Design a protein around this ligand. Structure first.
Ligand SMILES: N[C@@H](CC(=O)O)C(=O)O
Ligand SMILES: N[C@@H](CC(=O)O)C(=O)O
Ligand SMILES: N[C@@H](CC(=O)O)C(=O)O
Ligand code: NA
Ligand code: NA
Ligand code: NA
Ligand code: NA
Ligand code: NA
Ligand code: NA
Lengths: 400, 400, 400
């Protein structure tokens, strides 16, 4: 009966698109949107406990072989599927030509060392990192905690074996409880989906016209091809049924699509991975990493929009400019956060790499138009972002 | 032997009232007051762990019937006992006439959407909400966690039943430990009560004179009538012996009276509810909620002081304005936090409701005079605030 | 094979001292130093969980006798060994005369009630204190929690005994797991030691010359005499073989020396105390306390530098001023935090005690010179600070 999410999604996208066409976006923002916001509030509630607990228990696996190999593989999957998404976005923005009318405007006025990021992946107080919603530091600590718990259960002493067993059970009992709540809040998901889709359709409905229609088309048709030409093809190569994969991932896909936060849909994403029969050692490490590392819809978006500005500015991006886009957009997609709208902010990075700084007021003009339709683009962008998460999660799972 | 709190309270209110009448409030603030502050520090120490643990364990009950019915009942009790307390304060401030001398002054210069409060009751990181002292968000998460733990203990699998039992046991052992510390710090309570009663008596002793004596009298007599005509009567109606109820609640009453923080006296309040034989499913959820939601002494205070200001300005508050006072003071008593002094700040809200803004310097004169005696009033105010918590807690407990 | 820390330390101090003598301190700060920083990041990661868990489990001991006696003894040991370290620094700074050349400079421009510290040792939300890295408040709460758990295990009811045993096991399983991680990160310690020692050798290598060489010499020779004439002698008096004690504490000593943070080396310090056969009731409470309370190398440093400044200004510190130096530097060493550089900051306190404020630009000249060589001093300073922790920890352990 949970397929009523589509019922809540489809006709919900209509009632908002109607009211917004009569100056009722304020009525949606005052009555309808709070319900969909509450849905996101409930989803964010479960992220930190379900990620920490499942990954401590998920570290009940061969630490050198399993964790090391699933890591060094999924990072190569993530890097390859993101480098292919930005090239596909380039190809889309090359077949298409979103920037046609050179529209100048005035008053745009837009706008972290690597060692300072890597050294912060290792926390200095996991109680704070858990209390501050830092997923990568708590992934690191929970990996080390579960491995230490496993080493405790293999000693000759029974007291330390009994204590480690008592700790790991309570942590698993927490994880199981968090998954049951995921099912509970996913039962309310059709209402929250209906509300969040009435908004962003009553607000950013009529805006998408002209050259904005081309860039939205170029992204979405490239996003579907990313699902088909990459995920579907690579799933069949490793012998994973694509139709059944999508039939299960409908929940996490649409939840990411409507919420636009890959970190907010991670509880649903983790539960779907449990539903398809994936080892906890796999999805509890692969998915929270890919939530902030694997952004395929972002790199495609970023590769399309980076042509739209230059195409609307007359700038001719040579093959070298396209390759620097491919490289820089991958790096920007890694840094892009699992929160709604972040990809538009880090899109500046690839714009700077091609000698198109946001300082130029003419560049800031087109940038303001993209942020005016980001809500639409971000929905499908996050969906493919999480779809690639579950794809490589299942691929590396069935690789072991 | 713990009744020496009264011994520490009574003669402690004298030694401060004596020393304060000879310019020794600095000696109390430098030597005596730190002991009562440490008492509050120990009480605040236990609030977050004892509330989270006891309510997770308290969620080992029929979730639809028990929790739903105890909720929809205690919220109506809270709304009715607060709406009666503000009317009783109005009746007191009408029998009395605190504002007689129109005293003008110079240099007063005094001085959250509902959806932003309701949507904030649902946390987004329970690790942080526990680390930030947010009782309403941790109440919500602990309800859902215990229900999920109960649903885990009813599955056919033994592993998830063992893990859920392991988790719920450690949480209960934490709650039990917190209650034992409550008894330990309650043994030191007579000293902290003696110290906190030397202060506010050495500081705010002779201050209460004239119109200040009238408004303080009208408040306390309404608070006693609220205790007698409401709590005692409704206790007897539901077959609860009032005298034995007071014999149980003596600890939480004097602690709330002395501490003035309903959230700081909540550990003592929770222990008293256990001692009088209440199930955790009832009191462990009702009390922390009512600590911040149910404030009857606040609504009575606010209903009395809002008359004193208008009476000291000559403005005639019509019967319609008196009804808006009843409504707004209830809302302000709901929003008032369980920390000392919040009710005087939330009095501004009902003052705005009657067209008496704090911007007007004549309004700021009487407002600053009320804040100059708030300490004394706040003591009895918090006492009735927690008394109404324990009253309805026992009523709805014996209703099941 | 872990003795390769010395291999990483010794020749590591050379490769930095070489590269730093050719303008390659930036190459060390950009490539070498991040490795030693990561080592400190991993060490800080374990401090809060291993201290809370081990001390809750360590509270499984006779609370009045054991904890009370180990406390009232180790606080007297700490006060005596710190009062002797500052006198030894005075004797060193009197045998030596670091301040010889009165060097005036321009542009120095340098630069908490006791009740507010004591009352802050008692937390008001242990979830926050754990999430904020506050070791003294979590020490207090963990003492009270473990004692309450012990009182729970001695009741006639079996349910509360089972829950308390379930809680204490999971906490012990956490402590054991943290100790296993301490061994894991201590295996990486030789690399982090090699990186942190190449730094402050490439940075502060040639700097120590002249009066800087004299004050640094006076500090270290007093630190060694503090180790020999105090620790070694008092160990032998209480029947502890000094050579075997060093063979155990070699890890914590070199880690403290290299990290300069007594709180960052506390996990290694706690593990060494376990390896040398100390009950958790003693060391797990004594060590985290002494980490921030017992700093003998700090008081010696402060006693030496306070002479160097006055000697570089010509002011004659009388015997009475020398006694106030002893007292205030002990207080400054008590208040000094377990983070690198705090002792130089707390040196201002004893400088104010002798009428030598940092406001005087001539005082700020010598002060800036001491802060220009504080890094090396701090290395040996922290080493003796933690050495005195483990010394008295073992003494009071074998006293029970
Ligand atoms: N919505 C994306 C971020 C973005 O595309 O800006 C995510 O949460 O992963
Ligand atoms: N002292 C009250 C608040 C107030 O009266 O301002 C309470 O904590 O409930
Ligand atoms: N490094 C010392 C502080 C100092 O000497 O400044 C410590 O952490 O204990
Ligand atoms: Na993602
Ligand atoms: Na990303
Ligand atoms: Na309130
Ligand atoms: Na209350
Ligand atoms: Na100190
Ligand atoms: Na120390």
């Amino acid at each position: 009966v949970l397929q009523k999410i589509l019922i809540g999604l489809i006709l919900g996208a209509i009632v908002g698109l109607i009211l917004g066409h009569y100056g009722y976006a304020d009525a949606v923002k005052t009555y309808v949107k709070p319900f969909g916001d509450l849905f996101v509030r409930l989803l964010k509630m479960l992220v930190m406990p379900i990620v920490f607990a499942s990954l401590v228990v998920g570290a009940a696996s061969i630490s050198p072989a399993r964790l090391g190999r699933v890591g060094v593989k999924i990072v190569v999957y993530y890097l390859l599927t993101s480098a292919f998404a930005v090239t596909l976005g380039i190809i889309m923005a090359r077949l298409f030509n979103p920037g046609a009318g050179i529209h100048l405007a005035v008053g745009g006025q837009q706008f972290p060392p690597l060692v300072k990021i890597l050294l912060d992946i290792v926390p200095t107080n996991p109680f704070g990192a858990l209390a501050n919603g830092q997923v990568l530091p708590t992934i690191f600590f929970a990996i080390i905690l579960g491995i230490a718990i496993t080493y405790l259960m293999n000693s000759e002493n029974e007291k330390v074996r009994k204590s480690a067993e008592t700790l790991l059970d309570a942590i698993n009992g927490l994880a199981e409880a968090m998954y049951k709540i995921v099912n509970g809040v996913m039962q309310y998901a059709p209402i929250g989906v209906f509300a969040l889709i009435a908004y962003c359709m009553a607000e950013q409905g009529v805006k998408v016209v002209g050259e904005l229609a081309k860039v939205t088309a170029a992204v979405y048709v490239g996003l579907t091809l990313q699902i088909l030409l990459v995920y579907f093809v690579l799933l069949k190569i490793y012998g994973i049924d694509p139709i059944s994969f999508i039939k299960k991932a409908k929940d996490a896909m649409l939840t990411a699509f409507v919420t636009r936060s890959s970190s907010g849909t991670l509880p649903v994403t983790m539960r779907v991975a449990k539903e398809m029969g994936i080892s906890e050692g796999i999805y509890s490490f692969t998915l929270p990493l890919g939530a902030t590392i694997n952004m395929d819809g972002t790199a495609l978006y970023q590769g399309v929009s980076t042509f739209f500005i230059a195409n609307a500015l007359g700038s001719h991006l040579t093959v070298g400019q396209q390759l620097t886009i491919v490289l820089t957009a991958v790096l920007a997609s890694i840094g892009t956060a699992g929160v709604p709208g972040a990809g538009a902010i880090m899109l500046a990075m690839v714009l700077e790499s091609v000698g198109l700084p946001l300082t130029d007021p003419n560049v800031a003009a087109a940038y303001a138009m993209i942020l005016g339709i980001d809500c639409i683009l971000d929905m499908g962008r996050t969906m493919v972002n999480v779809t690639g998460d579950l794809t490589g999660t299942a691929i590396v799972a069935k690789t072991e």
